[PDB]
Curated annotation (Swiss-Prot), chain A:
Keywords, alphabetical: Calcium, Copper, Metal-binding, Oxidoreductase, Periplasm, Signal
Family label: Belongs to the NosZ family. In the C-terminal section; belongs to the cytochrome c oxidase subunit 2 family.
Stretches the record annotates as COX2-like: 485-581
Catalytic activity: N2 + 2 Fe(III)-[cytochrome c] + H2O = nitrous oxide + 2 Fe(II)-[cytochrome c] + 2 H(+)
Entry's Gene Ontology molecular function annotations: calcium ion binding; copper ion binding; cytochrome-c oxidase activity; nitrous-oxide reductase activity
Entry function: Nitrous-oxide reductase is part of a bacterial respiratory system which is activated under anaerobic conditions in the presence of nitrate or nitrous oxide.
Modification after translation, per record: Predicted to be exported by the Tat system. The position of the signal peptide cleavage has not been experimentally proven. The N-terminus is blocked.
Binding-site residues, Cu cation Z1: H269, H325
Subcellular location, principal: periplasm
Lineage of origin: Bacteria, Pseudomonadati, Pseudomonadota, Gammaproteobacteria, Pseudomonadales
Annotated gene: nosZ
The name this protein goes by in its record: Nitrous-oxide reductase
Keyword match DNA repair: no
Protein's cellular compartments: Periplasm
NCBIfam families: nitrous_NosZ_RR, TAT_signal_seq
Curated annotation (Swiss-Prot), chain B:
Protein's UniProt name: Probable ABC transporter binding protein NosD
Species of origin: Stutzerimonas stutzeri (Pseudomonas stutzeri)
Name of the encoding gene: nosD
Entries under Pfam families matching the protein: NosD
Similarity-based family: Belongs to the NosD family.
Record SUPFAM superfamilies: Pectin lyase-like
Induction: Induced in response to denitrifying conditions. Activation requires NosR and DnrD regulators.
Length: 581, 403, 153, 105
C-alpha cells in the first residue's frame, strides 16, 4: 500500500479517535496518523473558546459547571447501514453525557445529560433504516431514587438502564431497566435487536466479588417491542424526567417481553455485529473465548419458540488470553485483541462456527504481537456493511519504552496494521495522549465538509435571536448596548482590524462581546482574547459568537486577536476602558 | 437435594465421624453439619445429571474416598461435584474420584480448605469450552491444594482473587490451561506437573508468589505465561516441547509459535535455576521488565532462544552467573571463567544451530572465528539488547532434568 | 509535513541525550511537598495509611492506590462537606498510572507511580456516587471502583 | 536524511512546540513528529487533572480562576550556553504569566 502520505499527497481516511480522558475528539488522517483537528466536546478549550463562549455554555446547559469529561466511543450516524457523515455521537462516562458533533462544521452542537443513571460507558448507533436511536449503557448501579435514603446496592430498587436517545431531536426516547450493569452495547443490521454485555451479574460492590459467577450474560433488547410498549403508554417514570422507563428485569424467572438474557463467560467486555449482520460477537476478558450469537436466531428466541437461552450461541471460538474487542474486515474474518496474551489474533467466523459444530478446523489464521496491552481495535468501515479491510488501528494502553521517555506519565500507543492482503503487518506506531479508548474510520468521500459557516446555522441561533431582540443586524452593525449593568458589544470582524476598537463600561458590568467574521475567504479565522479576564474565543468566517464576563478590574485593559488573521495580527487590538464606581 | 442425614450413616463414635457403606446412592447431597464422611473403597454417588452433587455449607467437613459421576453440565449455575460455600471453613476434600462434565471442586471464598489427593476426570464428549473447570478457587485464603490429579477438564486448576494458597504436586493432564491464575497475590506453586495442555502455567496479574520446583511437560502454545508478575521468586521450573498451533492443513504465518517463558511487564522477579528446552522460543520479553534478576537458567535446543524487544540494555547476569545458552559459540579459555564472549543473541544463527547441529563445528574454524571476532567488534545486525556478560559453559539444572 | 492545532507559535529542540527524565516519581519531590505537609498536619503517613478524617464540614480522605484496588473503597460523608480526596500511588512499576474520577462531580485526576494528588470537591448531591479509575492500569480495571456514600442533610 | 521512524525505534530529537491558544506545551518527536506528550500548563486539563487538583491550583496561585491561556515561545533553561535539561519556561499572553516546567517529570 502507501505507508507514507508525504508533502503534497493527501490522507485517505478520516479517523475519529476520542480524546479519552481529556474529553476532546481527535480527527486524524489515516494512514498519515497526524492530528488534523481537535474538536473540544467536554473539556474547556481555550483555543475555540468551548465552555467559555455563550453558545457553548448554552449547548452544555447546566453541565458548564463541570471542567472535565471522559469520552470513550465515537460513532458516525449511519444511513441504510452505511456512514453518511451527518452527525457523530460520543459519550461521557465521567459525567454521564451524550454529545452530538455536526460533521460539516466539526463542532459539537448537542449535549444531553442523561438522567437517573451514572457512568455512560457503552454507546452505539442503530444501523437500519437509519440512525434513529442512539443506545448508551450506564456502567455503575445506583439506587432509585438516589435521594440518600438507602445506600444498599442489593435492594430491588438498585439497577441500571439501557438508555436510548432520539438521534435527531436529542431528547431521550426510552430507558430499559436491566439486571447487573452494562459495559458495551451494539446493534444489528435489522434494526430490531440491540445487545449489550453485562459483567457485574454477581451484583457485588466489593473487589473480588464481580468475578464470582462463571458466566455473566449479554442482554438482548427487542427494539420493536420497546417501541410498541412506548406507543401503548405502559411506561413508568422516575424523578423529574418524563423519559419513558421500561422494565427488562427478570421476574421470578419470567423473562421480560423486552429483554432476553444470554449467558456468556466471563465478564465480557466487547460486543460487535458481523459486517453481513449475521453474528453478534462478544469478547470474554477473563475467559479465553468469544461468544458468537446467530442474530437470525434471535426472533425465535424472543418469540418463545426456542429452548435454553444459550442455544442461540452458534460459536465459541477459543482465541487466547483476554479477548477485548472485535473488528471486522468485511471479507469473512474478524480481528480480536488478546489483552493478557498481548496480541491481535485473526480468525474466520464461518470456520469458527464449523469448528463449534464438531469438524476440526484451525480458525486462527494469524497472531500479531501488538505492543503492548491492546485495548479496542478498529478496522476501516467495520461498522458498515461496506467494510473494506484496508487498515486496522489497535490502541495499546501502555507504551513503556516504545517512545522517548516523557516522564512518569506515558502516552498510549495506537498502531496501524495493513490488512489489505492476507498478512497483518505493523505500519506505524503513534503516541496519543489521554488514552483514546476507541476509534472510527471513514472514507474521504463520505464526510462532506463546509469551508465557511452558513449565516442561518442552528449552532449560534440563540445569539442571532438575542440580536433581533436588540434590533442588531449582526452582518453589518457595530454598536454598544447598555441595559442595566449588562453591556453588549456587537461587532463585525475583518482582518486586520476589529469593528469596535473601544467601549467604556462601569466596574462590575457583565460585558457580552459578540463578534461576526464576515470575511468570505477560506481559513481566515480571527480570535478574541481579553488580557487578565479569562476571555478567549475563536471567530471563524461567517460565524458570530459571544462571550459574557464580569469586568471587575477597573482601569484600562487591552484585548488582542489570538489566531493569526493577517501579517499584522500583532496590530489588531482594542482598549476596553473600565471606569471605577 | 437431600442431605447426608439421609442414606446410611453407620456412625462411628466421637460424632465427628460418619462412615458410608458401598452402593449406588443416586441423587444430590448437601452437607449442613460438621461431619467427617469417610466411605468404603467403592461407593458411587450417581447424580443423574442435575448439578450440585455435594453442597458443603458447614465448617469442618472431611470427605474421603467418595466417587462421583455425571454430577452436572450447566456452567451458568456453576454446578460442581464439590461446592464449598464461604462459611464452610477448614473443610477437607481428600482422596475422591470425580468424573463429570463440570467443576470438580469449587471453593467460594472459604479459608483454610484442604483439597488433597483427588483424581478428577472430565468427559471428552463436550467441547473444551464447555467442559467446566477443575479445582476452581475464588477469594480463598489459607488453602492447600496438594497432589490432586485433574484430567480432561478445561483450565486445569483455576485461582482467582486469592492470597493464602499453597499448591504442590498437582498432576494436570489434557486440559486447556495448566494453572489458570488471575489476581492471586502471595501464593506458592511447587512440584506441579502440566502435560498436553494449551498453556502450562498462566501466571497473570499478581504479586509476591513463589513458583519454585514446578515442571511443565509437552504443552502447547505457551510454557510459562507471566503477566505483570512482580516481586516473585520464579525458580526450578522445567519446560519442554511447547508445540505450536499446528493441527490440520494450516500454517499460522508469523504466529502461533510456542514459547517456553513469556515474561511480560514483570519488573521484579528472581528467575534463576530454570530449564527451558525444545521450545519454539524462549524468554519472550516485551513491555518493561528492567530490574529483573535472571541467572543460572538453561536454554537447550530452542529454535530461537530470546525475543527481547525493549530499547533499553539489560544484563541477565547477576554476580557473574549467566545462562547455559546452547547457541553460545565457543570460548572458555580460563578453566572456570564462565565465558569471554558475551552472548549477544542473533535470531538467524539460532535457527542454523538448531536445524543443522553440526554448524558449530563449521563455526569453530579459525577463519570463521576471526570473522566472528570482527563481527563482535564492528556491530553487524543491530544489537537485540540482551547480553549476558558471563555466560555458562557447564550445563546447570542437571538435578531436575529427569526426576 | 505535519498538522498542528491551535497555532504553535514557536518551537524549541533538544537532543535525546540532553533531556533526562524520571521513570517514576520520588517522594521527596517538591511538586507535591505541600500535600505531604498537610499529611504531617494530621500525623498521616501517605505511604501506607488508608484513613478518613472528618472535622466539622471538612472531610479528608487519605488513601493509597495500587492497581487494581483503591485503599479506601468506601467513605461516608454528609452533604455540604468539602471532601479532600488525597490519594497516593504505592506502585513502583513504570507506566502503571491510575486515575480518580468521581461520577457527576467534575472530579478527575491522574496519578503516576509514587505520586500524591489531592482534590477538594463539594458533595452537593446526596446519595451513592460511584467513582472509578480513569487511566487503564490493570487487567481487572473493571473493579478499580469505589462507592462514595453521601448522607442526606 | 531518513524520515521513517519504524515500530520499535526511538526518535532522535525532543521538540517542545507550544500549544498556542491551547495553553499547553506539546512534546513531539523529531523527525517522526508524533505527539509524545501534551504537558498541560495553562488550560484546565481533564486527563492529568491539572487545574483541578490542590497541588495544581496551589501552583497557579490566584490565577486559577482563568480557564484560558495563550503560550507562544518555549525555551529550555541552559547552563554556559548549553542545555542542561532542567527547566523549560513558557509564556502566557492571555493572562500575563510565566510558567516553568521541570523536564524530568
Amino acid at each position: 500500500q502507501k505507508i507514507h502520505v508525504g508533502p503534497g499527497e493527501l490522507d485517505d481516511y478520516y479517523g475519529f479517535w476520542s480524546g479519552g480522558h481529556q474529553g476532546e475528539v481527535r480527527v486524524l488522517g489515516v494512514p498519515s496518523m497526524r492530528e488534523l483537528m481537535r474538536i473540544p466536546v467536554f473539556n474547556v478549550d481555550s483555543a475555540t473558546g468551548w465552555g467559555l463562549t455563550n453558545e457553548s455554555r448554552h449547548i452544555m446547559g447546566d453541565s458548564a459547571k463541570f471542567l472535565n469529561g471522559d469520552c470513550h466511543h465515537p460513532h458516525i450516524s449511519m444511513t441504510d447501514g452505511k456512514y453518511d457523515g451527518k452527525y457523530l455521537f460520543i459519550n461521557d462516562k465521567a459525567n454521564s453525557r451524550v454529545a452530538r458533533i455536526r460533521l460539516d462544521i466539526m463542532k459539537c452542537d448537542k449535549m444531553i445529560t442523561v438522567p437517573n443513571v451514572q457512568a455512560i460507558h457503552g454507546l452505539r448507533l442503530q444501523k437500519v433504516p437509519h440512525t434513529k436511536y442512539v443506545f448508551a449503557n450506564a456502567e455503575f448501579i445506583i439506587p432509585h431514587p438516589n435521594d440518600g435514603k438507602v445506600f444498599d446496592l442489593q435492594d430491588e430498587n438498585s439497577y441500571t438502564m439501557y438508555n436510548a436517545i432520539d438521534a435527531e431531536t436529542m431528547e431521550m426516547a426510552f430507558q430499559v431497566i436491566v439486571d447487573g450493569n452494562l459495559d458495551n452495547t451494539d446493534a444489528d443490521y435489522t434494526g430490531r435487536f440491540a445487545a449489550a454485555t453485562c459483567y457485574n451479574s454477581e451484583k457485588a460492590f466489593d473487589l473480588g466479588g464481580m468475578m464470582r459467577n462463571e458466566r455473566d450474560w449479554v442482554v438482548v433488547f427487542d427494539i420493536h417491542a420497546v417501541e410498541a410498549a412506548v406507543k401503548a403508554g405502559d411506561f413508568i417514570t422516575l424523578g423529574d424526567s418524563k423519559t419513558p422507563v421500561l422494565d427488562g428485569r427478570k421476574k421470578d424467572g419470567k423473562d421480560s417481553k423486552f429483554t432476553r438474557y444470554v449467558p456468556v463467560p466471563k465478564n465480557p467486555h466487547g460486543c460487535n455485529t458481523s459486517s453481513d449482520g449475521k453474528y453478534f460477537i462478544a469478547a470474554g476478558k477473563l475467559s479465553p473465548t468469544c461468544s458468537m450469537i446467530a442474530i437470525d436466531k434471535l426472533p425465535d428466541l424472543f418469540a418463545g419458540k426456542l429452548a435454553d437461552p444459550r442455544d442461540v450461541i452458534v460459536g465459541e471460538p477459543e482465541l487466547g488470553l483476554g479477548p477485548l474487542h472485535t473488528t471486522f474486515d468485511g471479507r469473512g474474518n474478524a480481528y480480536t485483541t488478546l489483552f493478557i496474551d498481548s496480541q491481535v489474533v485473526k480468525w474466520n467466523m464461518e470456520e469458527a462456527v464449523r469448528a463449534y459444530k464438531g469438524e476440526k478446523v484451525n480458525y486462527i489464521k494469524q497472531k500479531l504481537d501488538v505492543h503492548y496491552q491492546p485495548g479496542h481495535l478498529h478496522a476501516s468501515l467495520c461498522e458498515t456493511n461496506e467494510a473494506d479491510g484496508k487498515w486496522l488501528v489497535a490502541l495499546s494502553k501502555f507504551s513503556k519504552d516504545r517512545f522517548l521517555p516523557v516522564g512518569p506519565l506515558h502516552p498510549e500507543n495506537d498502531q496501524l496494521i495493513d490488512i489489505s492482503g492476507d498478512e497483518m503487518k505493523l505500519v506505524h506506531d503513534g503516541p496519543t495522549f489521554a488514552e483514546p479508548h476507541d476509534c472510527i474510520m471513514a472514507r474521504r468521500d463520505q464526510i462532506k465538509t463546509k469551508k465557511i459557516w452558513d449565516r442561518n446555522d442552528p449552532f449560534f441561533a440563540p445569539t442571532v435571536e438575542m440580536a433581533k431582540k436588540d434590533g442588531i443586524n449582526l452582518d453589518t452593525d457595530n454598536k454598544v448596548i447598555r441595559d442595566g449593568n449588562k453591556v453588549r458589544v456587537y461587532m463585525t470582524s475583518m482582518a486586520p482590524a476589529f469593528g469596535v476598537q473601544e467601549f467604556t463600561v462601569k466596574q462590575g458590568d457583565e460585558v457580552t462581546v459578540t463578534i461576526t467574521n464576515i470575511d468570505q475567504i477560506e481559513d481566515v479565522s480571527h480570535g478574541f482574547v481579553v488580557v487578565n479576564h479569562g476571555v478567549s474565543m475563536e471567530i471563524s468566517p461567517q460565524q458570530t459568537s459571544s462571550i459574557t464576563f464580569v469586568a471587575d478590574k477597573p482601569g484600562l485593559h487591552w484585548y488582542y486577536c489570538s489566531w493569526f488573521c493577517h501579517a499584522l495580527h500583532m496590530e489588531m487590538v482594542g482598549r476596553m476602558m473600565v471606569e471605577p464606581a | 437435594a437431600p442431605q447426608s442425614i439421609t442414606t446410611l450413616p453407620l456412625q462411628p463414635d466421637g460424632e465427628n465421624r460418619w462412615r458410608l457403606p458401598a452402593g449406588e446412592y443416586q441423587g444430590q447431597f448437601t452437607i449442613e453439619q460438621p461431619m467427617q464422611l469417610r466411605c468404603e473403597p467403592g461407593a458411587v454417588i450417581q447424580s443423574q445429571g442435575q448439578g450440585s452433587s455435594l453442597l458443603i455449607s458447614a465448617p469442618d467437613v472431611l470427605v474421603e474416598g467418595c466417587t462421583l459421576y455425571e454430577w452436572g453440565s450447566d456452567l451458568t449455575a456453576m454446578d460442581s461435584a464439590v461446592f464449598i460455600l464461604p462459611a464452610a471453613e477448614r473443610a477437607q476434600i481428600s482422596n475422591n474420584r470425580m468424573r463429570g462434565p463440570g467443576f470438580g471442586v469449587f471453593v467460594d471464598g472459604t479459608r483454610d480448605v484442604q483439597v488433597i489427593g483427588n483424581e478428577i476426570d472430565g468427559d471428552a464428549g463436550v467441547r473444551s469450552q464447555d467442559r467446566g473447570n477443575g479445582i476452581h478457587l475464588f477469594a480463598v485464603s489459607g488453602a492447600r491444594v496438594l497432589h490432586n490429579h485433574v484430567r480432561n477438564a478445561r483450565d486445569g486448576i483455576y485461582i482467582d482473587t486469592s492470597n493464602g494458597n499453597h499448591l504442590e504436586g498437582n498432576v494436570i493432564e489434557d486440559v486447556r490451561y495448566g494453572v489458570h491464575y488471575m489476581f492471586a497475590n502471595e501464593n506458592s506453586l511447587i512440584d506441579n506437573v502440566t502435560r498436553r495442555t494449551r498453556t502450562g502455567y498462566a501466571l497473570m496479574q499478581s504479586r509476591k508468589l513463589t513458583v519454585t520446583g514446578n515442571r511443565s511437560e509437552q504443552d502447547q502454545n505457551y510454557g510459562i505465561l507471566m503477566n505483570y508478575i512482580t516481586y516473585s521468586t520464579i525458580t526450578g521450573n522445567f519446560v519442554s516441547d511447547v508445540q505450536r498451533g499446528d493441527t490440520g492443513g494450516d500454517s499460522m504465518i508469523s504466529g502461533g509459535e510456542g514459547k517456553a517463558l513469556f515474561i511480560y511487564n514483570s519488573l521484579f522477579n528472581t528467575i534463576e535455576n530454570n530449564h527451558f528446552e525444545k521450545s519454539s522460543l524462549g524468554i519472550h520479553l516485551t513491555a518493561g521488565s528492567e530490574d529483573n534478576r535472571i541467572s543460572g537458567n538453561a536454554f537447550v535446543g530452542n529454535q530461537q532462544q530470546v525475543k527481547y524487544v525493549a530499547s533499553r540494555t539489560q544484563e541477565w547476569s547477576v554476580d557473574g552467573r549467566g545462562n547455559y545458552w546452547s547457541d553460545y559459540l565457543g570460548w572458555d579459555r580460563n578453566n572456570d571463567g564462565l565465558g569471554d564472549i558475551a552472548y549477544e543473541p542473533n535470531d538467524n544463527v539460532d535457527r542454523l544451530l538448531w536445524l543443522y547441529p553440526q554448524v558449530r563445528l563449521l563455526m569453530n574454524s579459525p577463519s570463521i572465528e576471526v570473522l566472528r571476532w570482527v563481527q563482535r567488534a564492528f556491530p553487524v545486525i543491530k544489537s537485540p539488547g540482551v547480553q549476558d556478560s558471563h555466560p555458562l559453559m557447564k550445563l546447570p539444572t542437571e538435578k531436575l532434568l529427569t526426576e
